């Protein structure tokens, strides 16, 4: 279909991948750092979900260099994909209004 939809869908699929990879990689980077809490996979997936959406409750977060980098990748992927859905909707609404007018 139209490019924007292809870009929006693609940057959902990619986001889901980043959530799983970002969840597996955060546990890998954080174990070994005394005091770290992002160390088991289930809560790490929850952590990534609340990071990508930018809600960030503060119940869990990375304390190591690599865990933080992973965090930045998760943030950008989520923000980027949401900005791509908004842009795709605007295109659909704009192109659609050109008709109603």
């Amino acid at each position, epitope marked *: 279909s139209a490019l924007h939809w292809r870009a929006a869908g693609a940057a959902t699929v990619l986001l889901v991948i980043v959530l799983l990879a970002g969840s*597996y990689l955060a*546990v890998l980077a954080e*174990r070994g750092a*005394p*005091g*770290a*809490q992002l*160390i*088991t*996979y289930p809560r790490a997936l929850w952590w990534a979900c609340e990071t990508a959406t930018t809600v960030x409750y503060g119940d869990l977060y990375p304390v190591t260099l690599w865990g933080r980098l992973v965090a930045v990748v998760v943030m950008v992927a989520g923000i980027t994909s949401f900005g791509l859905v908004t842009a795709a909707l605007a295109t659909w609404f704009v192109g659609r209004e050109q008709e109603r007018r």
Partner: antibody
Amino acid sequence: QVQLQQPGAELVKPGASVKLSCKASGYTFTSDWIHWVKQRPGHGLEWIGEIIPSYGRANYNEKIQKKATLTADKSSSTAFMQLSSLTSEDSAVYYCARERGDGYFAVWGAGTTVTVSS
Amino acid sequence: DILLTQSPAILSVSPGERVSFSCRASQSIGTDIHWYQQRTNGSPRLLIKYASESISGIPSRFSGSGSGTDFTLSINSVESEDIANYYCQQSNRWPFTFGSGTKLEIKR
């Protein structure tokens, strides 16, 4: 069937080094971590370290002197623990255990009795 | 690193009575506590996970409760096969750590 198989025992001379093994069976996931626990007679469980075979990274108990070195073999599904320059202080039963990345030790090996003596 | 205190070190109960093991953490760890049973010459065996979740194959007699810093492992009506050492283990913060242990002793 026995999920984790370990050799019943190992004799080591003071100052030498031995390598323990832990052959895994049953379901294996990318999120599995293999742990090693040291237990001296009459005492409790002391965590030594862990390793994630799928990636090869390992971590160790900082509170104690580092006598171990962990490695894994994906093809033979075997986790190994190398103990070096031992003394009688290192004589104990060494257990391996499997954790599915969710914090608890679902299953343990029978344990290898290590004795350091000339 | 989180210190897990198990006191008393030995507990004596009469056959059939209700017994309770205590585990105290040096800081709040939610419900990230797990219990293990180790009989004489045996390897540890998972009894209860996440403070209160049951494992399959474990007698209904065993139960756990608590959250935060205080945890309890309970056995409704203890029997001879329950004679063993009991350990708690936390997974809230790295590195995982074990309590020192409580020995269950029965008075017959």
